[PDB]
Symmetry: C2
Subunit: 93 residues, 2 copies
């Protein structure tokens, strides 16, 4: 099946849906990623309600203080945090 | 939309489709991950043709030499490698 493959194609499409909407299509930005999580992962990855949560999240990515992200840094950080949350409910049954 | 959200639900379902098929449903294994990539990401992440490629890939994950993976280690390693490949074709246009 393409279920797992479809997983890579989908995050890449929404990624180019908002990332290229700001014009900076060659680099991601702090506001661009804010839209992607609050759009489909708002309930899981809290972010829209805690705007401070997005400043902290980009800080690990923008460790360079570039206020911009290379998108690759983003996938590794949120990938581990959300995956851990699913096991959190399963751990207590 | 749930396109990005659907991305997390799909890799998690196939993950529990083969991971729980070996009985070791509490921990992933070297053969379990081999099936997930060769099943839907065979063409992108070469693996089935280069069985040596799977030994090397788990080595970074099983840096502990446990021949077993915590699944979380897996998502971060293959997440960055496949994402980079998509930009490889885009970089040369
Ligand atoms: Ca962008
Ligand atoms: Ca950055
Ligand atoms: Ca398993
Ligand atoms: Ca491991």
């Amino acid at each position: 099946g393409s279920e797992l493959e479809t997983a890579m194609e989908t995050l890449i499409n929404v990624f180019h849906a908002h990332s290229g909407k700001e014009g900076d299509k060659y680099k991601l930005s702090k506001k661009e990623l804010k839209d992607l999580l609050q759009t489909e992962l708002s309930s899981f990855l809290d972010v829209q309600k805690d705007a401070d949560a997005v400043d902290k999240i980009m800080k690990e990515l923008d460790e360079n203080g570039d206020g911009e992200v290379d998108f690759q840094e983003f996938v590794v950080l949120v990938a581990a945090l959300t995956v851990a949350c699913n096991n959190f409910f399963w751990e207590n049954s």
